[PDB]
C-alpha cells in the first residue's frame, strides 16, 4: 500500500498526470483513519527521499504536505525527531523543499531547534558534510522567514552560559550570519547590553588564535550588514572601546581592535575596485 | 596604532598612505615596499576613483614589469586628477 | 546596479546634449516603475537650477513626480526650490511659479515661507505671480 502510493507519487512528480490523484486522496483518507504521526512521517519520507529528486510535482507535493500536516496535528516530538534525522540523513536535491514545507509555527520552532543542534554538531565534529548540512538547514530556515529572532536570542543566551562549547556555537552563529545575510542584526546589537560582554570575554579567554581570526572574519562580515539601524551598532562599538564603558579593559581593547579592523575593511570595500565595474553595495 | 604586527593591517596602512600621498618619491617608497612584502598582487586596482583615458589605459597596461605598471599608472592618474 | 550608469552620466555631464538625452531616458523609464527617482535627488536639485529651459522643465517635472511617489521627501528639496524662486536668471523664477501650486500642496508644512517669497519676488521684481499663488490658496483651503 505504502510502496504503491510512493510509486504513484513519484510517477506523478515525474510525469504531470492525474492518474495518482485518486490514489493520493485514498492515502489521505487512510492516514486520517490510522491517525498515526509516525506512519505519516514515514510516508512523507518515502515521497521525498527519492521521489522529489527527479522532478517537481503538484499533486504529490500536496499529498506529502497533507501527510505532514496530519503527522503534525498531534504532538509527535519523537516523530519530529525521527523526521528531522531522516531528512538530514537524506539531504539529496529537494530535501529542504519538503522539510520546510510544513509552514507550522511549532514545526518551524522544532525545525529551528533541530537546525541549531545540527549546526552545533557540525561545529563540534568539524566535518565538511555536516557543515554543508548545517548550511543547507540555515538556508532552509532563511526562506521560512516568519519568526527566528526568538530562536536566535535563545541560542545566544545558551551560548553565553557555556564556556567550552561557546566558541563553537559563536563560530556557527557567525557563519550563519554570513549565510543568512544577518537577519537579526538590531536585536543582536540590543542584546549585548551590560553583562553579555563579560560572558563573551570569559568565553573568548578559553578560545585560541583561531578564535581571534574567526572574530576578525565575523567583524568584517558584520561590517557589510545591519542595514536597518547601523547608527546604534556604531555607537555601541564606539562607546565600548574609547569611552571605556565596558566592564573589562581587555574587552575595551578588543572593541578598539574591532573598530580599527572595521575601518580597514571599509576602506578596501569603498576604494579597491579598479576601472568602472558595478559598485559594491554595503 | 604603532607596531601593527599583522600582514593585512600593514597592507591597510600602506594602502591608506598610498591613497593619501601626493609626493611622488614617497609614493615610490610605498610601492617598492608594498611589492616587496607581497608576492604577486597588482596594486593599480586599489582605488577606483583613479581614471586614465581609454587609449592611454590601453597602452599603459603593456609594460611587462609589475612595479613599473603600478607606479606609472597611479602617478599619471594622480597627475591627471591634480590637474 | 541598474541605475549606476545613468547617474554616472548625470553627475559627469557638461553639455546640454548629454543632460537632455539622459533626462529623456530617465523620463521614459520612469513612466513605468516610478519608484526609481529616489536616487536622483541631489543631481535633480543641481540640474533644477540649470539655465537651459528644456532640461530645467524636465528636472522640475521629475521632481514633482518624485513628490507624487512619496511626499515625505518634499522637505529635502526646499532649499533648491527657494533658491530657484529667488535667483537672478529670470527663467528659473518663472518655471518655479509655473510649478508653484503643485509643490505648495506637496509641502504643506513650509508653504507659508514659499508663498511669502513668491509675493516678495513678484512684488519687488516687476512681474505678476498673483494667479498662481491665489490658485494655490484656493486649492489649499
Curated annotation (Swiss-Prot), chain A:
Region (Disordered): 72-94
Subcellular location, record wording: Nucleus; Cytoplasm; Nucleus membrane
Phosphoserine found at: 90
Top-rank taxon: Eukaryota
Subunit-structure text: Component of the Integrator complex, composed of core subunits INTS1, INTS2, INTS3, INTS4, INTS5, INTS6, INTS7, INTS8, INTS9/RC74, INTS10, INTS11/CPSF3L, INTS12, INTS13, INTS14 and INTS15. The core complex associates with protein phosphatase 2A subunits PPP2CA and PPP2R1A, to form the Integrator-PP2A (INTAC) complex.
Function: Component of the integrator complex, a multiprotein complex that terminates RNA polymerase II (Pol II) transcription in the promoter-proximal region of genes.
Family of the protein in this entry: Belongs to the Integrator subunit 5 family.
UniProt protein name: Integrator complex subunit 5
Protein species of origin: Homo sapiens
Residues of the full protein shown: 190 to 471 of 1019
Curated annotation (Swiss-Prot), chain B:
Subcellular location, record wording: Nucleus; Chromosome
Superkingdom of this protein's organism: Eukaryota
Transmembrane segments: none
Similarity section: Belongs to the Integrator subunit 8 family.
Disorder named in the UniProt entry: Neurodevelopmental disorder with cerebellar hypoplasia and spasticity: An autosomal recessive neurodevelopmental disorder characterized by global developmental delay, profound intellectual disability, seizures, absent speech, spasticity, facial and limb dysmorphism, and subtle structural brain abnormalities including cerebellar hypoplasia.
Domain notes: The WFEF motif is required for the recruitment of protein phosphatase 2A (PP2A) to transcription pause-release checkpoint.
Function: Component of the integrator complex, a multiprotein complex that terminates RNA polymerase II (Pol II) transcription in the promoter-proximal region of genes.
Complex and partners: Component of the Integrator complex, composed of core subunits INTS1, INTS2, INTS3, INTS4, INTS5, INTS6, INTS7, INTS8, INTS9/RC74, INTS10, INTS11/CPSF3L, INTS12, INTS13, INTS14 and INTS15. The core complex associates with protein phosphatase 2A subunits PPP2CA and PPP2R1A, to form the Integrator-PP2A (INTAC) complex.
Protein name: Integrator complex subunit 8
Organism annotation: Homo sapiens
Gene: INTS8
Span of the entire protein shown here: 499 to 581 of 995
Curated annotation (Swiss-Prot), chain C:
Subcellular location: Nucleus; Nucleus membrane
Disulfide bonds: none
Effect of residue 120 to P: In NDCAGF; uncertain significance
Functional summary from the UniProt entry: Component of the integrator complex, a multiprotein complex that terminates RNA polymerase II (Pol II) transcription in the promoter-proximal region of genes.
Disease affiliated with this protein: Neurodevelopmental disorder with cataracts, poor growth, and dysmorphic facies: An autosomal recessive neurodevelopmental disorder characterized by severe global developmental delay with motor impairment, cognitive delays, absent or severely limited speech, dysmorphic features, hypotonia and cataracts.
Family assignment from sequence similarity: Belongs to the Integrator subunit 1 family.
Quaternary organization: Component of the Integrator complex, composed of core subunits INTS1, INTS2, INTS3, INTS4, INTS5, INTS6, INTS7, INTS8, INTS9/RC74, INTS10, INTS11/CPSF3L, INTS12, INTS13, INTS14 and INTS15. The core complex associates with protein phosphatase 2A subunits PPP2CA and PPP2R1A, to form the Integrator-PP2A (INTAC) complex. Interacts with ESRRB, ESRRB is not a core component of the Integrator complex and this association is a bridge for the interaction with the multiprotein complex Integrator; attracts the transcriptional machinery.
Protein name as catalogued: Integrator complex subunit 1
Organism (species): Homo sapiens (Human)
Gene that this polypeptide is encoded by: INTS1
Shown segment, full-protein numbering: 2045 to 2185 of 2190
Amino acid at each position: 500500500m505504502d510502496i504503491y502510493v510512493q510509486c504513484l507519487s513519484a510517477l506523478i512528480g515525474s510525469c504531470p498526470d492525474a492518474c495518482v490523484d485518486a490514489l493520493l486522496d485514498t492515502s489521505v483518507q487512510h492516514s486520517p483513519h490510522f491517525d498515526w504521526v509516525v506512519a505519516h512521517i514515514g510516508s512523507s519520507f518515502p515521497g521525498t527521499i527519492i521521489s522529489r529528486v527527479l522532478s517537481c510535482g503538484l499533486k504529490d507535493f500536496c499529498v506529502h504536505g497533507g501527510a505532514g500536516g496530519g503527522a503534525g496535528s498531534s504532538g509527535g516530538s519523537s516523530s519530529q525527531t525521527p523526521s528531522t534525522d531522516p531528512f538530514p540523513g537524506s539531504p539529496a536535491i529537494p530535501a529542504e523543499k519538503r522539510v520546510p514545507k510544513i509552514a507550522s509555527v511549532v514545526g518551524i520552532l522544532g525545525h529551528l531547534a533541530s537546525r541549531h543542534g545540527d549546526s552545533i554538531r557540525r561545529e563540534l565534529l568539524r566535518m565538511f558534510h555536516d557543515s554543508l548540512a548545517g548550511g543547507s538547514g540555515g538556508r532552509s530556515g532563511d526562506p521560512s522567514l516568519q519568526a527566528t529572532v526568538p530562536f536566535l536570542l535563545q541560542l545566544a543566551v545558551m551560548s553565553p552560559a557555556l564556556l567550552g562549547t561557546v566558541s563553537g556555537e559563536l563560530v556557527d552563529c557567525l557563519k550563519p550570519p554570513a549565510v543568512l545575510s544577518q537577519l537579526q542584526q538590531h536585536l543582536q546589537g540590543f542584546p549585548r547590553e551590560e553583562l553579555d560582554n563579560m560572558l563573551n570575554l570569559a568565553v573568548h579567554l578559553v578560545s585560541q588564535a583561531s578564535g581571534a581570526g574567526a572574530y576578525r572574519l565575523l567583524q568584517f562580515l558584520v561590517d557589510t550588514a545591519m542595514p536597518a539601524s547601523v547608527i546604534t551598532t556604531q555607537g555601541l562599538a564606539v562607546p565600548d572601546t574609547v569611552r571605556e564603558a565596558c566592564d573589562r579593559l581587555i574587552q575595551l581593547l578588543l572593541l578598539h581592535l574591532q573598530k580599527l579592523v572595521h575601518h580597514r575593511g571599509g576602506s578596501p570595500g569603498e576604494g579597491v575596485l579598479g576601472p568602472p565595474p558595478p559598485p559594491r553595495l554595503v | 596604532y604603532d607596531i601593527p604586527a599583522s600582514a593585512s593591517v600593514n597592507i591597510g596602512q600602506l594602502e591608506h598612505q598610498l591613497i593619501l600621498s601626493v609626493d611622488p618619491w614617497r609614493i615610490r617608497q610605498i610601492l617598492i615596499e608594498l611589492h616587496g612584502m607581497t608576492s604577486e598582487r597588482q596594486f593599480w586596482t586599489v582605488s577606483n576613483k583613479w581614471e586614465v583615458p581609454s587609449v592611454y589605459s590601453g597602452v599603459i597596461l603593456g609594460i611587462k614589469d609589475n612595479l613599473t605598471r603600478d607606479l606609472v599608472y597611479i602617478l599619471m592618474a594622480k597627475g591627471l586628477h591634480c590637474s | 546596479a541598474e541605475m549606476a550608469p545613468y547617474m554616472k552620466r548625470l553627475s559627469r555631464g557638461q553639455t546640454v546634449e548629454d543632460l537632455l538625452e539622459v533626462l529623456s531616458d530617465i523620463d521614459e523609464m520612469s513612466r513605468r516603475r516610478p519608484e526609481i527617482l529616489s536616487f536622483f535627488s541631489t543631481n535633480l536639485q543641481r540640474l533644477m537650477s540649470s539655465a537651459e529651459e528644456c532640461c530645467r522643465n524636465l528636472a522640475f517635472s521629475l521632481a514633482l513626480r518624485s513628490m507624487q511617489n512619496s511626499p515625505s521627501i518634499a522637505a529635502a528639496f526646499l532649499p533648491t526650490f527657494m533658491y530657484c524662486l529667488g535667483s537672478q536668471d529670470f527663467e528659473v523664477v518663472q518655471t518655479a511659479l509655473r510649478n508653484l501650486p503643485e509643490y505648495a500642496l506637496l509641502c504643506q508644512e513650509h508653504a507659508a515661507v514659499l508663498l511669502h517669497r513668491a509675493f516678495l519676488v513678484g512684488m519687488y521684481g516687476q512681474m505678476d505671480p498673483s494667479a498662481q499663488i491665489s490658485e494655490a490658496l484656493r486649492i489649499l483651503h
